[PDB]
Design a protein around this ligand. Structure first.
Ligand SMILES: *C(=O)N1C[C@H](NOS(=O)(=O)O)CC[C@H]1C(N)=O
Length: 250
């Protein structure tokens, strides 16, 4: 466990980072207090909810559809019968809500328990209804389920090192749809952003969680901001994460 200073890449934004290489067990941690604090995963939960849907047969491939019903949404790309790959990349809320609501709560509870997914608290299945957004809510979106960045990395490692019971075919679907382009062919980066606002503490929950492969070595990582500035989003923290990867992990 090495405590590190990535503050220059955070460019004044409050947050922390954790990178873990499980081959040689090198844990690099910036802002240890934050990295151990549990928070809502927000859209980073799509990593796990995709695998749940595949395991239960609700979806089957990166082409799989969820039966769009014509409801009007402000995001153009949500207004179509999109595939799993597109719903993941466009963070289509209705697709992932419909997917998870086809799965019984005990199945979800047991999978989260097996993954040690934070507090594994799905008690508020419906999510944070007081924000007025109705069915565009769920237990993983600023609601009962909370996970620390360190726990995110531990879960990512267990999934992608093949240490869970999820099918390899399903892991590979997730890998494909998580891959991102960082304009450096010499590293393979995979990840997912998340964005929420913590109304109790007046702070954002801005996430980028994923993994990095660079010549035999793999790092699992979670970058997280808790800034009070509402302008700080998941996509912004992904930029920060990319800067760290290029500076220290290339
Ligand atoms: C996930 O955190 N969400 C879904 C969507 N995309 O977020 S992302 O750009 O950080 O991946 C909008 C924000 C958030 C939500 N409000 O549900």
């Amino acid at each position: 466990v090495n405590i590190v200073d990535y503050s220059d890449c955070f460019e004044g934004i409050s947050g922390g980072a954790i990178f873990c290489n499980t081959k040689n067990k090198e844990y690099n941690i910036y802002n240890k207090e934050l990295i151990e604090t549990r928070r809502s995963p927000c859209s980073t939960f799509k990593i796990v909810s995709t695998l749940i849907g595949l395991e239960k047969g609700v979806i089957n491939s990166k082409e799989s559809v969820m039966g769009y019903d014509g409801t009007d949404y402000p995001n153009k790309n949500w207004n179509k019968n999109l595939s799993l790959e597109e719903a993941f990349k466009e963070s289509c809320v209705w697709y992932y809500k419909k997917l998870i609501n086809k799965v019984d709560a005990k199945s979800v509870q047991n999978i989260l328990d097996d993954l040690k997914y934070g507090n594994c608290d799905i008690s508020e299945w419906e999510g944070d209804l007081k924000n007025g957004k109705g069915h565009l809510n769920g237990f993983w979106l600023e609601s009962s389920l909370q996970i620390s960045p360190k726990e995110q990395v531990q879960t990512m490692a267990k999934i992608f090192e093949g240490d869970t019971n999820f099918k390899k075919e399903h892991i590979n679907i997730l890998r494909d749809i998580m891959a991102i382009d960082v304009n450096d062919a010499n590293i393979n980066v995979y990840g997912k952003t998340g964005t929420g606002f913590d109304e109790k503490n007046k702070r954002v929950d801005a996430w980028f969680v994923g993994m990095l492969e660079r010549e035999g070595d793999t790092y699992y990582f979670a970058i997280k901001s808790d800034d009070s500035n509402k302008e700080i989003t998941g996509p912004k923290v992904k930029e920060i994460a990319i800067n760290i990867i290029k500076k220290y992990y290339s």
